[PDB]
Design an enzyme around this catalytic site. Sequence first.
Site, PDB file in Angstrom:
ATOM      1  N   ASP A 104       0.869  -1.222   0.000  1.00 56.53           N
ATOM      2  CA  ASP A 104       0.000   0.000   0.000  1.00 56.53           C
ATOM      3  C   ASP A 104       0.908   1.278   0.000  1.00 56.53           C
ATOM      4  OD1 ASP A 104      -2.855   1.014   0.248  1.00 56.53           O
ATOM      5  OD2 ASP A 104      -1.876   1.990   2.027  1.00 56.53           O
ATOM      6  N   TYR A 153     -12.381   9.108  -1.060  1.00 57.35           N
ATOM      7  CA  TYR A 153     -11.583   9.226   0.162  1.00 57.35           C
ATOM      8  C   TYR A 153     -10.335  10.114   0.022  1.00 57.35           C
ATOM      9  CZ  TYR A 153      -8.359   5.336  -1.272  1.00 57.35           C
ATOM     10  OH  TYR A 153      -7.441   4.522  -1.946  1.00 57.35           O
ATOM     11  N   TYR A 234      -1.621  11.268   2.304  1.00 58.60           N
ATOM     12  CA  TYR A 234      -2.494  11.661   1.178  1.00 58.60           C
ATOM     13  C   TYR A 234      -2.470  13.194   0.964  1.00 58.60           C
ATOM     14  CZ  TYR A 234      -4.444   6.939   1.570  1.00 58.60           C
ATOM     15  OH  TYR A 234      -4.604   5.604   1.673  1.00 58.60           O
ATOM     16  N   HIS A 299      -7.895  -6.199  -0.443  1.00 59.19           N
ATOM     17  CA  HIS A 299      -6.696  -5.368  -0.260  1.00 59.19           C
ATOM     18  C   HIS A 299      -5.645  -5.886   0.732  1.00 59.19           C
ATOM     19  CE1 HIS A 299      -4.451  -1.578  -0.143  1.00 59.19           C
ATOM     20  NE2 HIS A 299      -4.541  -1.664   1.170  1.00 59.19           N
TER      21      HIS A 299
END
Length: 321
Positions: A104, A153, A234, A299
């Site tokens: 990830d 998101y 992010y 995931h």
Amino acid sequence: KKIEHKMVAVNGLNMHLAELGEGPTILFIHGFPELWYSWRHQMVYLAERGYRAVAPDLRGYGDTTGAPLNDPSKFSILHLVGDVVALLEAIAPNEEKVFVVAHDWGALIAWHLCLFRPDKVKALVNLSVHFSKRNPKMNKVEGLKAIYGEDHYVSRFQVPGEIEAEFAPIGAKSVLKKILTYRDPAPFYFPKGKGLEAIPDAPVALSSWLSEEELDYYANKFEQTGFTGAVNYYRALPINWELTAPWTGAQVKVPTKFIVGEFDLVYHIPGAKEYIHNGGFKKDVPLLEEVVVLEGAAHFVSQERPHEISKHIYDFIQKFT
């Protein structure tokens, strides 16, 4: 031995490192919203086969301290790779190159580690996140918003404090359970004030791989830290896009194995399947092995399919001796 924990000072941080085993080093790099603990099954599996497994909490996560939560710019990909380079200098001083396993955000970090410092990586196993070739037109936030809209998101994560406030009344445990047990190939949506309501639930039998005790480990830690550190990765996507312009056209030169679950939302980003299987990926990563897709998995493959992942790791790294 049980897994041992220590604090290592690296790149301005006090980094928590979990360790198990002796022998050649394997560095494991977690993702979002995860911890060193996501590697629990692989640490054991590899330590029992003669390797030293090392798994940190990344900047902004878990027991790792010192990153300023109030400044997302300090969660750039350059800061993150700087952490990992310094960590390896501190904890593997007699190994010019180590094995790297990542997932990830950790895989993103590992791709850039391999780009910036291939001299430090023997071979790489990356989970979930394929090499992201830089799009010259726009950064990832803008790109993802154009496709999925403002409740996506990544977009909802942008302004500091907003998603934190959404999650506050819900509690870390519920947030984590919802994310950890998620199986639909669509991206997460977080519409303002709707909490977790836009995320569908899978049949409960499909999350029997996550025990209550394991869930509580993550919940208890995120309840202490909050989510700001993790979400800040992010928030740094726009600067990451600017800062990585020097590497346009550059190839990852490290031997690599890539593994992804069938239902991982990241694998269903438009264009991802085509990049991954039809040659783009192999052009950017010329020493990429045949790609592995885990049937019936989503995931969080290291926890969902621990045996498959652990063995995939072992069998790959055994090729280098």
